[PDB]
Amino acid sequence: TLRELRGRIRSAGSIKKITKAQELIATSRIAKAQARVEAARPYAAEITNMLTELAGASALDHPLLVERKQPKRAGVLVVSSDRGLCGAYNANVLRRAEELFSLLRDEGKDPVLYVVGRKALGYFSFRQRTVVESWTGFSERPTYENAREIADTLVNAFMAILGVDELHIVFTEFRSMLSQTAVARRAAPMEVEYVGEYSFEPDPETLFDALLPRYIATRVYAALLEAAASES
Amino acid sequence: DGQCFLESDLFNQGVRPAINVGVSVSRVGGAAQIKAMKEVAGSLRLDLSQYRELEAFAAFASDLDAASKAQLDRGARLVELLKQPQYSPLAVEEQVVAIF
């Protein structure tokens, strides 16, 4: 029995060393991901600003801004880690996702799954809920190319092929190093908020149409970066 | 000349008679089996020991090689094949067919 206990002590010491190293590396990567979020913020601010100007000079009738007559289907973009050891992280996302489904089911819209991350993909593969498309390998270190691909697929599904009448993104917001909360945001149809009180080339309507997809791509990118920081 | 190490963990897991394939051994081996069962079950014990080792190794592997996954499936099916309810003896021919 003493041999077993010595072996267990050696195992636990090795695991303590490995987990301590992972903790420190994760601290460094929290720093990196938060720095990337800060770097990406100014572009988001400026694109939001010019979007507000274009909207102030637009009819606000783009499909991304108007509610379908009878929403029968809704997309959900679950952002999840592609490697484990993050504790409740994935669950906290996935649970919230299902909460959203319970809402969507109660509102008569069957959710259609788009998943980012291997862990959520396995989560849904075991509950046999079909994912239309899944992306993997960039939750630890996402790039705007992945965000643009995700946003383009989601927007094409929204415009539509069966398509969707709505789309939500479920992801873990990083508010502080202590707090990391899974939230669900409806990213289309966007609601116009009148906050109260320029030239355009060739016209503000075409710029608005070209920019709304870009704005959604930027917001998906910010969500993915936020999810990466929260994962770390 | 041998040992059939019955383990409580296997018994609870539903592996009955609960023979720990790895530790168990019969040194007479094939000489104590009819030729048919020797042929069908020649490497069964070592195959199951390797399967148990792989299953313990592949407990938390995200993805597995094709050979490893096939080995795990074969071993799981063999383990289910070696389960047997109490007071349900099988004639040797039925055993060779089952292991076949």
């Binding site: 939001t48 979007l51 507000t52 100007e53 909207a55 102030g56 606000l60 801004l65 959203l100 809402l103 939500h168 939230v183 669900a184 945001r185 409806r186 990213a187 289309a188 966007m190 609601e191 116009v192 908020e193 009148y194 906050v195 109260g196 009180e197 917001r219 | 067919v97 076949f100």
Partner: peptide, 29 residues
Amino acid sequence: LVSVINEFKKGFQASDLEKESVKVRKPAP
């Protein structure tokens, strides 16, 4: 035996929220 196994397998029945918004810089619709 192999043929019997295959023909039997032929007949064997296997048991198997917030919202994104566009800020418009005018007071009312």
